[PDB]
Design an enzyme around this catalytic site. Structure first.
Site, PDB file in Angstrom:
ATOM      1  N   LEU A   8       0.928  -1.323   0.037  1.00 54.64           N
ATOM      2  CA  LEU A   8       0.009   0.024   0.031  1.00 54.64           C
ATOM      3  C   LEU A   8       0.669   1.348  -0.001  1.00 54.64           C
ATOM      4  O   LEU A   8       1.834   1.350   0.558  1.00 54.64           O
ATOM      5  CB  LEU A   8      -1.009  -0.016   1.169  1.00 54.64           C
ATOM      6  CG  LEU A   8      -2.027  -1.140   1.282  1.00 54.64           C
ATOM      7  CD1 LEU A   8      -2.608  -0.985   2.751  1.00 54.64           C
ATOM      8  CD2 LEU A   8      -2.842  -1.065   0.075  1.00 54.64           C
ATOM      9  N   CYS A   9       0.596   2.222  -0.893  1.00 50.88           N
ATOM     10  CA  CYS A   9       0.927   3.503  -0.700  1.00 50.88           C
ATOM     11  C   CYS A   9      -0.078   4.564  -0.623  1.00 50.88           C
ATOM     12  O   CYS A   9      -1.317   4.166  -0.419  1.00 50.88           O
ATOM     13  CB  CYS A   9       1.978   3.850  -2.183  1.00 50.88           C
ATOM     14  SG  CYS A   9       1.020   3.870  -3.575  1.00 50.88           S
ATOM     15  N   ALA A  10       0.359   5.814  -0.563  1.00 53.71           N
ATOM     16  CA  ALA A  10      -0.736   7.130  -0.563  1.00 53.71           C
ATOM     17  C   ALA A  10      -1.240   7.501  -2.023  1.00 53.71           C
ATOM     18  O   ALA A  10      -1.670   8.508  -2.002  1.00 53.71           O
ATOM     19  CB  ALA A  10       0.185   8.155   0.178  1.00 53.71           C
TER      20      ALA A  10
END
Length: 104
Positions: A8-10
């Site tokens: 997961l990233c932003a």
């Protein structure tokens, strides 16, 4: 069962860099692992599909809350820092080793 990993990233797309490295390492090494990527915030209903969730550097601030969310399902959660993460994205072998060392 195949080990299922979610990075997961932003939303920058950096998570895909690590998912790709993991998948290339898994493929070349012939180990049963698949990695996907996604944005933090689109994961609340799908997280139970996964065995290991890896937070990219820019979502490190969500580690504690994600650990609480993981507690009902026993999902493994790992957070990364910038230099660590970028090194993994450049090495399929190291990316795969990182996954397995966090899912013993």
């Amino acid at each position: 069962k195949e080990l299922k990993v979610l990075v997961l990233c932003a939303g920058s797309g950096t998570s895909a860099q690590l998912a790709n490295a993991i998948n290339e390492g898994a493929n070349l090494t012939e180990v049963r692992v698949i990695a996907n990527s996604g944005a933090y915030g689109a994961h609340y209903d799908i997280m139970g599909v996964y065995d290991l969730i890896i937070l990219a550097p820019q979502v490190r601030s969500y580690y504690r809350e994600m650990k609480v969310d993981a507690e009902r399902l026993g999902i493994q959660i790992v957070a990364t820092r910038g230099m660590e993460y970028i090194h993994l994205t450049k090495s399929p072998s190291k990316a795969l080793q990182f996954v397995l060392e966090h899912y013993q």
